[PDB]
């Protein structure tokens, strides 16, 4: 499943709701710590909508859980992330996936 | 994932709402065809509630796509259902799960 570490503190009410749209920065990582992928190398925020299926199970499940402002550890094992078959040179086979996770705003 | 393949039709405007309580009668079986269970063998029908993770994850999204009155089978593969442990004496490890389901009516 996916497991959640607290790192800072969000406000603690506002959670996302279906139809919302997300605004997050992330650092997505192995579990070695190796990075794979970071919005924070982009120059702009990841975004998506929560209940549309725009992005790997763990993430519907995890980021629904923060509230605006919380900085989080996601931790997703395989069966919530690329599964057996993973990603072509991103994401390797049964690959357990880390995500330092920053939810922004809702709009 | 969940294949749903229909078997008979159902009203095809009544669709199952997150949070409310499904009725549905069930037959589960191996991918070789071996029955594990059925509430067709038990008096009554199975009863469950969705969006509050009382079941396993492919009947969650599977029984959300069927409207009352509808028969289908369910393909679930382990990742959607027991994973690679399986649940001891009733489904193997690795197990893909076949479901006959018959959503009976919404309350
Ligand atoms: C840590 C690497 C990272 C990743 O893992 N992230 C991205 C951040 C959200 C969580 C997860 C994801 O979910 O990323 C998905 C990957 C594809 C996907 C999507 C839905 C799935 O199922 C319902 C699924 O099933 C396995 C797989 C994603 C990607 C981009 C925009 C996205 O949002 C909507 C859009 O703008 O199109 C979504 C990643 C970034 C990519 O680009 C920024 C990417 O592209 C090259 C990619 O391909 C594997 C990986
Ligand atoms: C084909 C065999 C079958 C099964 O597979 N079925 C049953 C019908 C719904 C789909 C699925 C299920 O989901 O069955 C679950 C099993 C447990 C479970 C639950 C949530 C999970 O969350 C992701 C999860 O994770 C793996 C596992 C279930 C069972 C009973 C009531 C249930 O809910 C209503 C109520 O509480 O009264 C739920 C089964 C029947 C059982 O009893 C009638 C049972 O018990 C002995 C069981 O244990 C493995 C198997």
Same mark, same amino acid.
């Given at each position: 499943?996916?497991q @959640? #570490?607290?790192?800072?503190?969000? /406000?603690?009410?506002? %959670? ?6 997300? @605004? ?7 579990? /070695?710590?190796?990075?794979? /992928?970071?919005? !924070? /190398?982009?120059?702009?925020? %990841?975004? %998506? ?7 790997? !199970?763990?993430? #519907? #499940? ?8 919380? !900085?989080?550890?996601? +931790? ?8 057996? +078959? ?9 690959? +357990?996936? @880390? %995500?330092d996770? #920053? ?5």
């Amino acid at each position: 499943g996916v497991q @959640v #570490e607290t790192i800072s503190p969000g /406000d603690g009410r506002t %959670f996302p709701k279906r139809g919302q749209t997300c @605004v997050v920065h992330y650092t997505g990582m192995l579990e /070695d710590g190796k990075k794979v /992928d970071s919005s !924070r /190398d982009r120059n702009k925020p %990841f975004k %998506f909508m929560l209940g549309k299926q725009e992005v790997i !199970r763990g993430w #519907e #499940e995890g980021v629904a859980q923060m509230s605006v402002g919380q !900085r989080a550890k996601l +931790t997703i094992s395989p069966d919530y992330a690329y599964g057996a +078959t993973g990603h072509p040179g991103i994401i390797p086979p049964h690959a +357990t996936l @880390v %995500f330092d996770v #920053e939810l922004l705003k809702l709009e």
